[PDB]
Amino acid sequence: PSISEIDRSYLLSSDRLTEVDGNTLDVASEEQVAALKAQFENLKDGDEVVIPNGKYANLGQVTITANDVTIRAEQAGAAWLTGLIQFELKGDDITLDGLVFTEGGPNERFGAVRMMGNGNTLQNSTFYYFNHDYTYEPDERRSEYPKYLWVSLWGKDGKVINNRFEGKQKRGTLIGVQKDDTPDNHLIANNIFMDQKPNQFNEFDIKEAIRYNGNSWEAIRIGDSKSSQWDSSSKFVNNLMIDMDGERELISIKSGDNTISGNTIFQSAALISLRHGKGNTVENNMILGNEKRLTGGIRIYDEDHVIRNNYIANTRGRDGVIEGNADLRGGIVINTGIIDVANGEQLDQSVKGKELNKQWTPKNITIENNSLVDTEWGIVYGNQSHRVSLFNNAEVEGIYAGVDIAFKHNVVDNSQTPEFVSVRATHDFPLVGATYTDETYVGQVTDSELIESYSVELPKVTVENGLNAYQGEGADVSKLSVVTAETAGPDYVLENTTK
């Protein structure tokens, strides 16, 4: 299967996968649910709970205080936890293994799994449309729907690995990292994410509330505005993402020193977003839009980031549907911001209008050896207007272009449809101190006079296992590979599920 022919059956297929039939599982009685629950809360260090095959409704608030415990399905995929539940993991070195969360929802808004301890792990588990049973209504203050997460990490050295997160379709980031002032070193790797999408419950019908109701549907948010000026040093690596269309941000990085690398992002109308925080690296990802509307690569605020060796193909669309959220899309988008970083200006919680949750003009960004192939909007130099907040629609006055953006060895290849815009420069917001080394742009370049030099001649193109390899330029195909269910997600698939 070569790039343009990839589809979800290929990505999700593997011989290694067992099939678990939900219809073969018995529904635990109220008495048995209670018995399982006491087992959880009576755990001593070093013990294990093995959950017999079955469906367990409304376990509710499950607090694990023990350390070095495993809670696992007796057969992977065959312990289905339904109705309202939250595992509150307070101990260290707690592992949840082979669980299913479906036909129900989190018992508290920070998720079915609150990883509060250190060395907590969630593995081989599946969430299937876990959007139910909790109250979900526009609030009285401002008709805002509540944000419910599925997994949150509040400790150190968490792992979320080999899980399947399918069908998140009510508001709230699917995974949230809530961190303090020191590195977290979490690993979120080898997971499958599918079919996150907004406005399935008429949320957007309240027109006045759209800018915030249409926000907070990320697949993962690492950090938050208050914690954003500290390092997380977390990794979001080797994941497979299919039809993830939650909002403009697929992955919202809001802290420093993170790695967002080697993921395959297929037909997802949502971008990797370096939203707050410094020194993040986005590398070796395969972003395959497959001509789907409003697909895109990476959008960039703040400083010192490295964007290297990504392969971004067949993406489409420039303007997101909700206005006022700077939702400008393309392969790689250098956003405008609201602070004069060329003169050393910072966001600062004390400075009114320039608080840490606002928009840090990008500076000192290295963008090197990327291949953008058949991208309708390739490298887009930002021109967004910004509003005071998600709740205040006034426009900010004073908008700045990216600074010290260093472009080297990128290939933007629109030779197939050269009317597509390979590089969108703009005299409305000229980059400051931008540099160009051995760039190759084929296709429309707007306000091209702003760019010192580039080549319009593609080097020798070979197809090396389905990818375009450009001789001596662009993404090195040796560092790239498509993630499939051969390595991503759990070791089983479920049947007879209900959305």
CB of residue 165 to Na ion, shortest distance in Å: 17
Going by the DSSP 8-state scheme, the letter that residue 198 receives in this structure is S
Binding of residue 376 to Na ion (CB under 5 A) = no
Find the length of the chain: 499
Within 13 Å and on the Cβ side, how many CA atoms surround 431? Answer: 30
d(CA 1, CA 256): 37
In the complex with Na ion, the residue whose CB is nearer, 92 or 249, is 249
In the complex with Na ion, the residue whose CB is nearer, 104 or 277, is 277
CB of residue 249 to Na ion, shortest distance in Å: 4
CA angle at residue 138 from 254 to 195, to 5 degrees?
55
Q: Hunting for tokens 């588990």 — which residue is that?
A: 125
Q: From residue 448 to residue 487, what is the string marking binding to Na ion with x (rule CB under 5 A)?
A: ----------------------------------------
In the complex with Na ion, the residue whose CB is nearer, 215 or 410, is 215
Binding of residue 245 to Na ion (CB under 5 A) = no
In the complex with Na ion, the residue whose CB is nearer, 50 or 322, is 322
Binding of residue 97 to Na ion (CB under 5 A) = no
Binding of residue 327 to Na ion (CB under 5 A) = no
In the complex with Na ion, the residue whose CB is nearer, 249 or 404, is 249
DSSP reduced 3-state for 130: coil
From 54-62, 210-218, 380-388, 393-401, give the range in contact with Na ion by CB under 5 A.
Answer: 210-218
Smallest CA-to-CA distance from 291 within 308, 273, 268 is with 268
From 90-98, 153-161, 207-215, 223-231, give the range in contact with Na ion by CB under 5 A.
Answer: 207-215
Task: Label the pairing between strands 60-64 and 95-97.
Answer: unpaired
In the complex with Na ion, the residue whose CB is nearer, 191 or 215, is 215
d(CA 120, CA 96): 8
In the complex with Na ion, the residue whose CB is nearer, 80 or 217, is 217
Which amino acid would we find at residue 19? Answer: E
Smallest CA-to-CA distance from 440 within 455, 422, 451, 452 is with 455
CB of residue 462 to Na ion, shortest distance in Å: 39
In the complex with Na ion, the residue whose CB is nearer, 129 or 217, is 217
From 214-222, 256-264, 295-303, 456-464, give the range in contact with Na ion by CB under 5 A.
Answer: 214-222
d(CA 392, CA 211): 10
In the complex with Na ion, the residue whose CB is nearer, 217 or 420, is 217
**Which three-class secondary structure string do you get for 344-403?**
CCCCCCCCCCCCCCCCCCCEEEEEECCEEECCCEEEEECCCCCECCCCCCCECCCCECCE
d(CA 336, CA 358): 12
CB of residue 173 to Na ion, shortest distance in Å: 8
Binding of residue 144 to Na ion (CB under 5 A) = no
Strands (E), 17-149: 18-21, 48-51, 54-57, 60-64, 70-73, 79-89, 95-97, 99-106, 113-115, 121-123, 126-128
Whether 305 contacts 282, CB under 8 Å: yes
Interface positions, 348-367, toward Na ion (CB under 5 A): none
In the complex with Na ion, the residue whose CB is nearer, 231 or 249, is 249
CB of residue 198 to Na ion, shortest distance in Å: 11
CB of residue 218 to Na ion, shortest distance in Å: 5
Binding of residue 103 to Na ion (CB under 5 A) = no
d(CA 296, CA 316): 7
Whether 56 contacts 82, CB under 8 Å: yes
CB of residue 252 to Na ion, shortest distance in Å: 5
CB of residue 215 to Na ion, shortest distance in Å: 5
From 108-116, 134-142, 195-203, 242-250, give the range in contact with Na ion by CB under 5 A.
Answer: 242-250
Ramachandran quadrant class, 26 (left: phi over 0; alpha: psi -120 to 50; beta: rest):
beta
CB of residue 248 to Na ion, shortest distance in Å: 6
Smallest CA-to-CA distance from 4 within 285, 264, 417, 290 is with 290
Binding of residue 368 to Na ion (CB under 5 A) = no
Residue of closest CB approach to Na ion = 249
d(CA 125, CA 341): 44
Task: Label the pairing between strands 235-237 and 259-261.
Answer: parallel
Binding of residue 249 to Na ion (CB under 5 A) = yes
CB of residue 273 to Na ion, shortest distance in Å: 7
Number of amino acids touching Na ion (CB under 5 A): 2
From 215-223, 302-310, 403-411, 458-466, give the range in contact with Na ion by CB under 5 A.
Answer: 215-223
CB of residue 217 to Na ion, shortest distance in Å: 7
* Distance in angstroms between the alpha carbons of the first and the last residue of the chain: 30
Q: Which residues bind Na ion (CB under 5 A)?
A: 215, 249
